[PDB]
Amino acid sequence: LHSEIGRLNNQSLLWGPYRPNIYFGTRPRIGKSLMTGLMWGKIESYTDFQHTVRYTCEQNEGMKGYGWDEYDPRRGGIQSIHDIQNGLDITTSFVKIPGGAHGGSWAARIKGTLNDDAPKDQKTIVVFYVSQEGENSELEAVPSENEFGYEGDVILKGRSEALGNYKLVVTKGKGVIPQSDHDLSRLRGPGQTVVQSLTYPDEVLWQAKPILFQQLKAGIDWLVENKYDVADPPPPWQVYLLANKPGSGNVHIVQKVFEGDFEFDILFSSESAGKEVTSKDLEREVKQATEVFGERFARVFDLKAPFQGDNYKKFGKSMFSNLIGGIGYFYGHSLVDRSYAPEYDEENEGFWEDAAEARARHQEALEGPYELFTSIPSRPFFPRGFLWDEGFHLLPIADWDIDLALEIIKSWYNLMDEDGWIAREQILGAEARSKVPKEFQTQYPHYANPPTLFLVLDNFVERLRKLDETLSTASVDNPEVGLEYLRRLYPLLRRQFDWFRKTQAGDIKSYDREAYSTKEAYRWRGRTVSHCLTSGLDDYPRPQPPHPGELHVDLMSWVGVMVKSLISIGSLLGATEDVEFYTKVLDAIEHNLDDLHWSEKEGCYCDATIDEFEEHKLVCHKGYISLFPFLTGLLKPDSPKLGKLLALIGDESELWSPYGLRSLSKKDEFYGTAENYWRSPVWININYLAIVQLYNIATQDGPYKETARDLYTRLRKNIVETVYRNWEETGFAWEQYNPETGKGQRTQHFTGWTSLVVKIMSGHH
Numbered sequence: 001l002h003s004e005i006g007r008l009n010n011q012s013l014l015w016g017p018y019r020p021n022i023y024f025g026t027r028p029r030i031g032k033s034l035m036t037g038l039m040w041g042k043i044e045s046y047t048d049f050q051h052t053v054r055y056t057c058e059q060n061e062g063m064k065g066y067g068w069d070e071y072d073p074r075r076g077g078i079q080s081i082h083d084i085q086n087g088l089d090i091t092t093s094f095v096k097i098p099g100g101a102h103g104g105s106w107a108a109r110i111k112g113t114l115n116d117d118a119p120k121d122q123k124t125i126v127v128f129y130v131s132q133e134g135e136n137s138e139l140e141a142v143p144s145e146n147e148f149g150y151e152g153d154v155i156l157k158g159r160s161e162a163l164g165n166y167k168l169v170v171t172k173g174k175g176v177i178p179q180s181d182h183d184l185s186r187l188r189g190p191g192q193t194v195v196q197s198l199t200y201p202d203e204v205l206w207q208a209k210p211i212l213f214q215q216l217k218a219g220i221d222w223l224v225e226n227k228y229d230v231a232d233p234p235p236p237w238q239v240y241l242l243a244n245k246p247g248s249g250n251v252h253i254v255q256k257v258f259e260g261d262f263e264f265d266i267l268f269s270s271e272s273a274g275k276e277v278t279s280k281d282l283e284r285e286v287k288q289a290t291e292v293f294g295e296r297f298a299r300v301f302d303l304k305a306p307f308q309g310d311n312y313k314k315f316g317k318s319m320f321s322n323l324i325g326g327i328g329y330f331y332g333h334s335l336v337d338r339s340y341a342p343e344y345d346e347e348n349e350g351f352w353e354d355a356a357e358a359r360a361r362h363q364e365a366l367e368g369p370y371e372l373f374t375s376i377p378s379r380p381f382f383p384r385g386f387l388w389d390e391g392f393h394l395l396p397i398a399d400w401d402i403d404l405a406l407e408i409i410k411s412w413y414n415l416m417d418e419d420g421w422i423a424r425e426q427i428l429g430a431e432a433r434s435k436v437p438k439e440f441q442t443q444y445p446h447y448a449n450p451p452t453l454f455l456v457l458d459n460f461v462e463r464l465r466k467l468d469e470t471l472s473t474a475s476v477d478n479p480e481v482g483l484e485y486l487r488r489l490y491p492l493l494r495r496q497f498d499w500f501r502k503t504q505a506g507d508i509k510s511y512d513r514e515a516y517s518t519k520e521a522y523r524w525r526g527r528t529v530s531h532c533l534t535s536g537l538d539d540y541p542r543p544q545p546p547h548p549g550e551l552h553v554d555l556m557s558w559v560g561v562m563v564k565s566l567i568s569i570g571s572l573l574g575a576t577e578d579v580e581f582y583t584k585v586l587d588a589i590e591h592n593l594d595d596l597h598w599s600e601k602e603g604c605y606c607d608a609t610i611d612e613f614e615e616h617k618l619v620c621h622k623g624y625i626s627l628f629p630f631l632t633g634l635l636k637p638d639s640p641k642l643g644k645l646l647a648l649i650g651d652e653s654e655l656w657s658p659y660g661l662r663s664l665s666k667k668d669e670f671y672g673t674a675e676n677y678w679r680s681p682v683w684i685n686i687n688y689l690a691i692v693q694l695y696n697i698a699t700q701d702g703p704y705k706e707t708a709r710d711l712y713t714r715l716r717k718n719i720v721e722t723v724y725r726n727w728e729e730t731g732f733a734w735e736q737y738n739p740e741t742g743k744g745q746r747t748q749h750f751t752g753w754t755s756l757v758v759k760i761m762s763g764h765h
């Protein structure tokens with residue numbers, strides 16, 4: 001039955017708009033297959049279209065906003081794009097139709113409406129670009145009856161091992177098509193849908209913009225050669241209309257020009273299924289998907305007071321939809337330094353200069369290929385897998401569709417190498433790389449990232465203990481299936497646990513350090529004078545200078561999160577030998593958090609170094625780091641240390657702003673200094689951890705029940721309202737929030753862990 005659910009999940013999830021790096025495009029969960037993308041831009045001049053054309057996601061003055069109004073990857077959804085530069089409001093509706101043996105069928109409606117500022121007679125170029133990778137696959141444009149292009153539908157017939165036989169149709173659509181009275185119309189026609197069918201080597205098919213522009217340029221060169229000149233030039237929109245040449249190839253460019261509003265459909269029909277998909281099917285299944293999205297949202301994200309209002313529900317639907325709508329399928333080689341240079345051990349003072357010298361040997365090489373199916377922080381800025389971000393992303397997604405979340409977890413752990421390393425940043429293939437400066441592509445097998453994916457696994461375990469509808473929960477509804485998933489993943493979780501303990505070890509034994517355990521102590525590898533990128537809190541202040549005797553309380557707390565998860569999963573699988581070890585490690589971390597990291601003077605947890613005189617020193621910088629044992633759920637609800645942490649959390653002069661918890665205390669010497677990334681702003685991912693732990697204490701007997709209830713109530717309200725007010729004013733989820741003004745700052749379209757807000761509103765943890 002595990003095998004049966006696996007195949008049905010495969011078939012359900014195969015097709016999607018799984019190219020979140022571009023406004024709109026489709027690909028299946030197959031490395032070398034059929035991909036589509038949408039391009040559009042106004043044309044007012046002989047030179048403007050190169051500057052107006054849209055393809056890859058951006059955010060700037062020219063784009064008001066964009067995102068998914070509703071989305072669920074098994075069914076499809078609706079995207080809204082508000083383009084000021086091109087004066088267009090665009091809708092892309094995408095729907096999946098199950099059937100046959102090859103992942104089913106799908107359809108898209110593209111609709112563009114001029115805004116009130118646009119010229120009513122605006123000419124808009126729209127391109128549908130289709131590519132297919134594979135040695136033994138075929139794709140052919142059926143030629144038109146008409147001389148110069150198509151009056152009706154463009155039909156593509158293709159075949160592959162992976163998709164079987166299929167037909168991809170771009171409909172005639174509705175809208176005025178401009179007609180040229182120019183002499184050129186005798187050879188190029190007066191204006192119509194055109195198709196160019198081309199072949200390039202498989203590895204460059206993703207470069208749609210340059211491929212398109214090379215064809216436009218060859219057309220303009222043809223005009224120059226054949227005496228079309230500035231004495232009497234064709235109109236711009238005819239100069240940029242490709243000569244019709246349909247045929248077979250691994251690239252097909254479908255170009256339409258519209259005057260005023262337009263719409264057209266894309267119908268992908270799987271031959272292995274029944275009747276071919278129609279525009280009538282598309283309209284019906286779009287209406288059905290909305291109805292089903294609506295009913296699941298009310299069940300899963302039942303917003304509690306005081307966020308019951310319709311405004312909050314629309315806000316919640318927008319944040320959730322953009323998070324799950326960012327799901328991508330990536331395929332290609334990663335760039336990895338596999339030298340394991342001894343400088344990467346960082347055992348000496350000044351280790352950052354040694355490691356810089358090693359990096360400057362440039363022994364990094366492409367390896368793979370790998371695939372990844374994952375949500376992303378940001379379409380315009382970070383359209384790729386980040387390891388600790390994905391733990392936050394999957395908390396709401398698992399509520400929606402636990403089988404989807406387990407698919408993404410499996411996809412991530414299938415990247416783990418023999419030693420137990422997953423790269424914190426997955427840049428798979430040339431397309432993924434095109435967005436990342438070379439200096440920043442190379443992954444390092446000594447760089448960790450917080451194991452936040454274990455949190456998702458903890459939610460799954462608690463749910464396990466206590467057709468698209470049925471599939472979404474198969475892995476909890478059928479315990480045999482749930483357990484088999486954990487049996488197969490369990491060794492990889494354990495391998496990662498051992499990797500952390502082996503590669504991120506701190507030094508107790510070699511200094512004057514007293515503690516309950518000689519073993520449990522941790523130091524993030526990879527830190528520079530001003531940074532610790534691997535912790536996730538890039539520029540949160542750490543001991544100066546960095547030093548091989550450093551110990552990091554967040555890293556120890558993360559290892560606690562992992563042991564506790566392995567106790568749970570180990571127990572379920574009857575791995576008795578394993579569970580007794582985990583139990584002794586947990587006990588050791590509990591004691592060593594106090595013996596190495598607790599400051600009585602300051603009343604919080606601290607990172608540690610060793611002095612100029614080789615002695616253990618605490619270095620206290622009050623902020624997220626100070627609370628880590630509490631954020632990760634390691635403290636007993638009666639702990640005196642908890643009470644001191646609750647006082648710190650609640651203190652307005654330290655962490656507590658009207659807009660949420662500050663990353664760093666106003667009292668710290670490093671408040672608002674340097675890049676001020678994690679040195680004052682409010683981050684929703686760490687606020688979400690605080691909110692969940694306060695709620696845990698508020699719904700249990702103990703000395704802090706009422707303190708925790710008050711802080712829970714207020715922090716939930718402060719966080720939700722800051723994210724909502726900013727969404728209402730800007731249309732955006734932001735990366736972080738200003739604790740003086742409450743303004744969203746840094747990166748827009750951060751959905752992204754800012755979307756946890758939908759879990760905070762729905763409550764009941």
Ligand SMILES: CS(=O)(=O)c1cc(Br)cc(NCc2cccc(CN3C[C@H](O)[C@@H](O)[C@H](O)[C@H]3CO)c2)c1
Nearest residue numbers: 377382386388389531535536537538539675677746
């Ligand atoms: C002056 S700056 O404000 O542009 C600035 C200051 C400092 Br210092 C460092 C950086 N790095 C750039 C950078 C690269 C890749 C992803 C991110 C986004 N975040 C950063 C999160 O910290 C990380 O936890 C999270 O996984 C990651 C993904 O969501 C950012 C930028």
Ligand SMILES: *[C@@H]1O[C@H](CO)[C@@H](O)[C@H](O)[C@H]1NC(C)=O
Nearest residue numbers: 007009010011029162373407
């Ligand atoms: C889905 O089935 C195909 C069959 O060719 C298989 O090779 C592929 O790995 C499966 N997809 C996954 C594991 O998501």
